[PDB]
């Protein structure tokens, strides 16, 4: 009997099995009676779906059926931590889950909410099915390569290393760049389902693939979106948000900048977090 990496049997948990035969742990927040819409929540690198409890509960409050899974190599899902054969796996897997929920709740509009890496996944999912999603909520999505990490030198170095030693890694992120809310930083640091290990070279290449794929995908992207971004984000530079606003073809696009705020806007200072929740609430309400 298959168990999570934390040794809980999948038979005890909501789950699905992906096209690669890997078990992904699933999470649902269902309203009473008929939901108005579906929304998938797509987490970032190193994290898991459990970190979207509050957001998901608020959205369920609006009579949406919220669903999520932990990406392969994350959380309670199977796979070597923060490694993937190709970035598209993540997209393929989101689509499988979406397709399943649509089977079960047909005729309902479906939305995507993504943060960071999960934001890139959400963009690529929408690009793969033009015209299909009713909307996208992007919290500081991974949109461009960090300028010094993208130096053709290191990109060459990484590609070379990946064929000889892919399980070399770079530094753990400094967790204090995630949020000015030091309470939230502590929680990040003490969540056993978060992988805080350094970024593996083989994964970095896939993150570089994603950024490239997202940029190819922008001029063909038409889905309505709300984009939220902190001005002081050291992980996804605010410049990427302006690039997104400029390149997307979407007729319905809105950007909010949060002055001074870090990366994890939904776990930022209370004044930023309450704004985030409210804005998402309004934006999804008006489109359901
Ligand atoms: O709540 C949380 C918890 O901590 C988090 C940690 C990470 C993310 C996330 O998904 N990020 C940040 C890291 C960057 C790395 O980017 C690169 C690195 C190396 C390279 F060569 C190229 C690139 Cl493009 C990707 C996007 C999000 C959260 N959010």
Tell me the C-alpha distance between 178 and 184, whole Å. Answer: 9
* Residues with C-beta less than 6 Å from any ligand 1 atom: 44-47, 116-117, 142, 145-146, 149, 173, 178, 188, 199, 204, 207-208, 211, 235, 264
Q: Cβ of 217: how many Cβ atoms within 10 Å? A: 18
Told to judge if 149 belongs to the known catalytic residues of this protein, a careful annotator would answer no
CA-based end-to-end distance of the chain: 41
Burial of 210 (0-12, 13-18, 19+ CB in 10 A): buried
Tell me the C-alpha distance between 199 and 181, whole Å. Answer: 24
Tell me the C-alpha distance between 23 and 113, whole Å. Answer: 22
Handedness of CA 6, 9, 13, 14 (dihedral sign): positive
3-class secondary-structure state, position 192: coil
- The rounded Å distance from CA 175 to ligand 1 centre is 11
Tell me the C-alpha distance between 264 and 84, whole Å. Answer: 23
Catalytic residue of the set 15, 43, 69, 263: 263
Q: Determine the atom of ligand 1 nearest the C-alpha atom of 175.
A: 4
Q: Determine the atom of ligand 1 nearest the C-alpha atom of 119.
A: 10
Technique employed here was X-ray
Told to judge if 278 belongs to the known catalytic residues of this protein, a careful annotator would answer no
- The rounded Å distance from CA 111 to ligand 1 centre is 23
What does residue 96 show for φ and ψ, rounded to 5 degrees? -60, -45
Query: 133: closest CA among 22, 244, 252?
Result: 252
Q: Which residues contact 29 (CB under 8 A, 6 or more apart)?
A: 56, 57, 59, 60, 65, 66, 67
Name the residue of 54, 263, 268 to mutate for ligand 1: max ligand atoms within 8 A of Cβ: 263
Told to judge if 231 belongs to the known catalytic residues of this protein, a careful annotator would answer no
Tell me the C-alpha distance between 84 and 198, whole Å. Answer: 15
What is the full DSSP assignment across the chain? --B-TTS-BGGGS-EEE-TTS-EEEEEEE--SSS-SEEEEEE--TT--GGGGHHHHHHHHTTTEEEEEEPPTTSTTS-SSTT--S-THHHHHHHHHHHHHHHHHSTT--EEEEEETHHHHHHHHHHHHSTT--SEEEEES---S--TTTS-HHHHHHHHHHHHH-TT-B-PPP-GGGS-S-HHHHHHHHT-TTS--SPPBHHHHHHHHHHHHHHHHHGGG----EEEEEETT-SSS-HHHHHHHHHH---SSEEEEEETT--S-GGGS-HHHHHHHHHHHHHHHHHH-
Query: 116: closest CA among 13, 202, 44?
Result: 44
- The rounded Å distance from CA 205 to ligand 1 centre is 12
Q: Cβ of 287: how many Cβ atoms within 10 Å? A: 14
């Amino acid at each position: 009997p298959r168990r999570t990496p934390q040794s809980i049997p999948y038979q005890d948990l909501p789950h699905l099995v992906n096209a690669d035969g890997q078990y992904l742990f699933c999470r649902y927040w269902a309203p009473t009676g008929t939901p108005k819409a579906l929304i998938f929540v797509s987490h970032g690198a190193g994290e898991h779906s459990g970190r979207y409890e509050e957001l998901a509960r608020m959205l369920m409050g609006l009579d949406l059926l919220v669903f999520a899974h932990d990406h392969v190599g994350h959380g309670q899902s199977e796979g070597e931590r923060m490694v993937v054969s190709d970035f598209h796996v993540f997209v393929r897997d989101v689509l499988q889950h979406v397709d399943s929920m649509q089977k079960d709740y047909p005729g309902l509009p479906v939305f995507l909410l993504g943060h960071s890496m999960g934001g890139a996944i959400a963009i690529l999912t929408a690009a793969e099915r033009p015209g299909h999603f009713a909307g996208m909520v992007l919290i500081s999505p991974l949109v461009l390569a960090n300028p010094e990490s993208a130096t053709t030198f290191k990109v060459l170095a990484a590609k070379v290393l990946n064929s000889v030693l892919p399980n070399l890694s770079s530094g753990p992120i400094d967790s204090s760049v995630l949020s000015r809310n030091k309470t939230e930083v502590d929680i990040y640091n003490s969540d056993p389902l978060i992988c805080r290990a350094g970024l593996k070279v083989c994964f970095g290449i896939q993150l570089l693939n994603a950024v490239s794929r997202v940029e190819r995908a922008l001029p063909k992207l038409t889905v309505p979106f709300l984009l939220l971004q902190g001005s002081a984000d050291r992980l996804c530079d605010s410049k990427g948000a302006y690039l997104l606003m400029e390149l997307a073809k979407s007729q319905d696009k809105t950007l909010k900048i949060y002055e001074g705020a870090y990366h994890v806007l939904h776990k930022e200072l209370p004044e930023v977090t309450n704004s985030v929740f409210h804005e998402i609430n309004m934006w999804v309400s008006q489109r359901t």
